[PDB]
Symmetry: C6
Subunit: 286 residues, 6 copies
């Protein structure tokens, strides 16, 4: 070997098969998907470079709001990384701060370490990682977990990848207070969402996750709803959406229970109708 | 099975028998009772949907003032939930923050866990839950109880339902500081009551709970009392009501002891008369 | 039984015999004594009501200054309560915060619990109870004692009565910080004593407690003293009174030792004379 | 017995023999000595009253500056108290805060208790007692010592007397923060000192304690010194006196070493001469 | 021996062979290299002085930014020091604060001590040493590590050299708070890198460390980039450089993957082209 | 014996031989040396007084800047004290706060105590003692070391002398906060040095301690240097001097290494020349 065919590796790795898996398994967020397509390319090239004699550097940060594909992309990353020979067992260990820090004084270091043992050969995924740093609280022993984490991200490299994730404002603050992470994360990925279309996409995903469908009439009813809701006080984006869908679901349940034609099937029970949304006082004025 | 008769489940579950039990066992708060009627409908439908292949999501929050039916509705919920096959042993474990958090450093995690063991197959009911988060205090180890609680509400699902309850202002603040609860509570129920009529309803419920009745004359005497009391300093709503009723009870006891016609019966001993309320310095001016 | 003769219970209980015992054993504070007379009536009636099928609710708070009869009334309460079948062994366990909270981390819960064991069947009396809540101090474990106390006042009812006592300003603050006590205390009793007459009453009680009498001339000498003292800086009410009486006692002792007519009797040794008070620089101007 | 001869007890107790012992063993502070004479009288009378059927109340506070006779009066008190049958073994146990509070968490309660065991039948003397209350410091466990102390001063009475002593400003503050002491101290004794004569008395006592005498010429030299020193900045009363005497002693030593007539005797070595004081830059202007 | 030939020692030690090793193994930072050349001279002379009868004093501080040669110079120091007979086993033990301080209360002193055992006969290298002093955090036991460190730097001298390193602002602050280090460091070495040329040098070193080269066209493209970037908000110097190079690398990877002429060699894969930098929105205006 | 020949003791003790040792072993600071001469005289006399029947009082404080002879005088004191029979084994135990206070909670009292055991029969020397009082820090247990120290300085006297030393501003503050030390220190010794001449003396002592001499030309070069340096920002007195001498030493080493006439002797290697100082940018303007 002297040169390297990139497409040979791309087609030989099954990396394309994981990138396809990502398009199919994430309701269109092309922005992000392209960014992962691009990182795949770099990950490919870096590997081809390592195969011609030139340890990588892999850790990444995923920042954005709830419901932007952080977890489901992270899973695919572990895949991709296992397919490009960066990781041995391409498996994702997803953990919060409450899996790494123990209440008792000294029961944190074995806990982080053992979680790490389970992570080895794959990817550790620390959701809202910045919660490990709580000097707000006394008797929270999260600084030890940081120390052990930080030490691992520099030293014990070739057998682990770490992904910190969560809100960006909170992550960037976490790096201020705990530097040495910025230099250890090679991949900062922003997960963007909200515009009406985005809020509607969210509404749609939420309903897919619950196995409910809207009737076309109800879809337009929601689009109306959203536009109005965003001009009323204390609009909470995604929360306001969950909340509307919750109340819609409650209304749909009562609509059906009160009708009672007789037996009804999955479509009748999975469908949110125009009535269920338009009955909201959001359409009255509040 | 292909369609599902909802009324068949509603009548087969005995869910109606628990909803009747609620009307009979809660002095009219039709507002709330309708909201529970409605949630019952959704809980019904969701179940019928789970029975056609489409884990639920059950936790709820009860917000409002003291004396609005939070506990007595929660009890009925545990019933309803057991009747709709969501819960195995339909029993309510009611706990405050002082049942989950221990003084000693590490004697909290076994305590929360064991309470949880007692809760399993039924409903855990955390009154004024927001008191678990006390970063105001040092040496209070309530954050561990939150961690264990939060972990349970996501992971170990199909064998427990949690109801956080208490004042709304304090609950919404608690979610700010401890997010991840908002997404875990599927049912936000507001318990409304204060207007004179509400204060009078409260007075009425308090007296029912103690087995005392008022004479019509005394009722109007209280309505007079309330209107005056609310314009005097340090009006404490429900507390001022308990306090007036306490003093009325004391006056009624002394009225009866001092009269002493001879023997007297349950009505004489259960009745608060016009004298007992009007004797208050609230009618003098203070 | 269908009706109930109240006087039959009042005379059968020996409750009157304890109320007489109170008049005889408390230098006239008719205000309070009437309030206890009245509570007795209610306690009577409530009992007669429980005997016709209609658990009581018994805990109380005693608020006021040192030397108003809190302890000596509490003792009689335990009596009264035992005579009306509310309490099994009518005995009063009087405790401060230093009997419930231990220095060591975890040596508080057995200590509160064991004190409670000694209290069972009678009345526990927590003097200046608000001292259990010291978040001012670190390493004071008083919050656990509160938790155990609070739990007992709701759950393990029919075998214990609790009386919190002390200054009112401090008690009401204690309820702010630790709510759930207000609802558990059914009896708020205020112990009143300052106006000149009150200061003089205090002076009088203090001297009774020490077995000293004043000569009429000395009484008027004190009334003069008080009026002057209250217009001088740093007037501390009751403390200033103790302090004057202390100095009077010292002067009386030296008056007698220096005279030495020969032997002298109890009256000579128990009497504070006009000289003993008027010799004060309070009469000179300071 | 019906009356009581006071002089009989005063002469029979040997109380006079301890009061004489006080005059002889305290360089004239007649102010204080009279106050102790007076307290003796009251202590006498109270005893004669207890002997005619009318538990005492004994604890006291000694406030003032260093070098006013607090300790040497306290010793005599223990005497007096043993002679008037208030105390069984008339012995004084003198302790600071560092004898009652231990560093380790829980090694304070046995330490206070054992000190107290040694105190029993006599007088415990807590110098600068207010140092037991250090909420300024964390990991100081002085509040437990307060609790145990306070409990002893009310409950276990007839076998112990406590004397808190030290600066008055600091003592009165200590009572603010720890009330319940004011009511437990029956004897507040102020120890007054400074006027030139007092500063000179102090100088004199200091030199007696060290076995040094001044020559009459040097005495007048000091009186000159004092008057000047008090008008220069940062005058520290007693400290400035120690400091002058220290420097005088140093000068006297060098005066003698440099002279060296031959052998010299106790007078030559015990004497501070006019040279030793007048050589001070205080006489130059600084 | 009477005089000493310095060049004899310089050539006999192999000290020159380590200084050559430094030029070859550190991409030109002549500023620093001269400072190390100079220190070598002094270290030489001091040794020649010790060999004529006149314990040295060796500890040093390395201050500057990431990527200025601190570690790679420290390694050579250990060499040099071993070649001039100051150190027995010329080996460098590189440690952070997380290797010296343990979470548990008392598991720090054995940990520092054992690290020190491994350090003996060579050089201990504490990166960002100032992190040992964290009074910001409770339950961090770093002050003990300071104590043990400080004690070693004075007492147990002839068998250890310590090098504290990191940012200068943070180091000088660390000396304020922990004095006694300034007197123990005999060698303060500043590591300089920002001016455009410096930022470009940094960019260059970063790319060397990653095995990437720029085409001359791309170099000028970066110089353009830098000048623009420094006038846009939140310019973070070196971070902004890493960030640009990261994004350039990502663009280079995608440029190559998308072209796909066929096989490509190390130069094609190591080269960042003009396209990869100029594609930045920094050239659009943001 | 009746009188006492002082010169007999002075010549018999070998006290003169230690005072000579002080002149020879401290580069002229006649001010201090006279003060120690004088204290010797007093220590002599006090001893002669104790030998004629009239426990001493020995502890002292040494205040001043770094480099004024505190340690080297303290050593001689231990000598002197052993020669005048005040101390049994005339040996000096020199300790900082980091030798008395342990990190762990309770590992301070054995540590202070054992250090004290090593001190017994000689002098304990606490450098910068005021660092034992750190209420600035939590989890520093220095107050216990104070307690044990303070207790020793009063009680266990005849087998230990304590010397607190360091900056005066910081010492006097330490006495404010921890009184009872002022009365326990019988000897306050001020160590004076800064004026140009003093800075030059310091420079001179520093160079003696390192075995370097200046050429007369270089001395005047330093005097020039000092005058300029003190008018430039952040002048740090003694530190600026060390720093200049360090850089001079570095320059001298490089001057010699670069010349290389051939062999060179101790004078050439010990000498700092005019070149080595004048090459400083302090002479350029910065
Ligand atoms: N891009 C997406 N495509 C499909 N579903 C999504 C997407 N993003 C979020 N969701 C839905 O919202 C939930 C949020 O998932 P997650 O990745 O864990 O969020 P986070 O951004 O906090 O990491 C998912 O379980 C899923 O049901
Ligand atoms: N809605 C209601 N209907 C009948 N009684 C009520 C109602 N609300 C409150 N009460 C009375 O007041 C008490 C308050 O009960 P609870 O549910 O525990 O209050 P919360 O949960 O809001 O703190 C009840 O035990 C009952 O006696
Ligand atoms: N109402 C009263 N009648 C007679 N003596 C009283 C009365 N109140 C207080 N005293 C006297 O003052 C003391 C104060 O007693 P206590 O009841 O324990 O005070 P408190 O409970 O208010 O703290 C009593 O021991 C008693 O000698
Ligand atoms: N009234 C006094 N008569 C004789 N000596 C005194 C007197 N007051 C103080 N001293 C001297 O000063 C020292 C201070 O003693 P002490 O009673 O302990 O002071 P404090 O007021 O702090 O309790 C004594 O040991 C003694 O040498
Ligand atoms: N002077 C230099 N010469 C060549 N490469 C350097 C130099 N300084 C830094 N680097 C590069 O940057 C990285 C920073 O290394 P390091 O010395 O550990 O940083 P620091 O000690 O300043 O924290 C090195 O691994 C190296 O690849
Ligand atoms: N008076 C002095 N005479 C000679 N050398 C001194 C003198 N003062 C300081 N030094 C030098 O400086 C160092 C400072 O010593 P030290 O007594 O420990 O200072 P300090 O006690 O004031 O902190 C000494 O070891 C010595 O080399
Ligand atoms: O509180 C909200 C919604 O808050 P959010 O913006 O969080 O949804 C009100 O608009 C509803 O109570 C009205 O319900 P309905 O629309 O059924 O009347
Ligand atoms: O303190 C209150 C009532 O407070 P609250 O508002 O909490 O009831 C006074 O009005 C009563 O003491 C009067 O009693 P009465 O009315 O019997 O004179
Ligand atoms: O300090 C006080 C009294 O304070 P309080 O107001 O607390 O009593 C002075 O008036 C007395 O010292 C005078 O005593 P006499 O009156 O014997 O001179
Ligand atoms: O510091 C002081 C005294 O302080 P204090 O007021 O505390 O004594 C100066 O007056 C002395 O140094 C002078 O000594 P001398 O008088 O021997 O010159
Ligand atoms: O956030 C930054 C860079 O921050 P930093 O200054 O830290 O690099 C934006 O300029 C980029 O998102 C633009 O990327 P591109 O230049 O590829 O559009
Ligand atoms: O930082 C300082 C000195 O600080 P300090 O005042 O602490 O010495 C500069 O003057 C030197 O870098 C110049 O060195 P040179 O004089 O060799 O150029």
């Amino acid at each position: 070997p002297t040169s390297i065919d990139l497409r040979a590796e791309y087609e030989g790795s099954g990396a394309k098969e994981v990138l396809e898996e990502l398009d199919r398994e994430l309701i269109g967020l092309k922005p992000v998907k392209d960014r992962i397509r691009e990182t795949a390319a770099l990950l490919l090239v870096e590997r081809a470079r390592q195969k011609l004699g030139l340890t990588p550097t892999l850790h990444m940060s995923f920042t954005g709001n709830p419901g932007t594909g952080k977890t489901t992309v992270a899973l695919k990353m572990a895949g991709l990384l296992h397919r490009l020979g960066y990781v041995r067992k391409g498996h994702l260990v997803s953990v919060t701060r409450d899996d790494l820090v123990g209440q008792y004084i000294g029961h944190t270091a074995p806990k982080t370490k053992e979680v790490l043992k389970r992570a080895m050969g794959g990817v550790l995924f620390i959701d809202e990682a910045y919660y490990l740093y709580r000097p707000d609280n006394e008797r929270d022993y999260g600084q030890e977990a940081i120390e052990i984490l930080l030490q691992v991200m520099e030293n014990n490299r070739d057998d682990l990848v770490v992904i910190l994730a969560g809100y960006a404002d909170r992550m960037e603050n976490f790096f201020q207070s705990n530097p040495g992470f910025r230099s250890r994360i090679a991949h900062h990925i922003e997960f963007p969402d909200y515009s009406d279309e985005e809020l509607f996409e969210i509404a749609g995903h939420m309903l897919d996750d619950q196995n409910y469908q809207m009737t076309p009439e109800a879809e337009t009813a929601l689009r109306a709803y959203i536009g109005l809701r965003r001009n009323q006080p204390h609009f909470a984006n995604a929360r306001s959406i969950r909340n509307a869908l919750d109340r819609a679901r409650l209304r749909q349940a009562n609509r059906l229970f009160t009708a009672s034609s007789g037996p009804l099937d999955a479509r009748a029970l999975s469908t949110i109708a125009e009535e269920d949304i338009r009955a909201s006082r959001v359409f009255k004025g509040g």
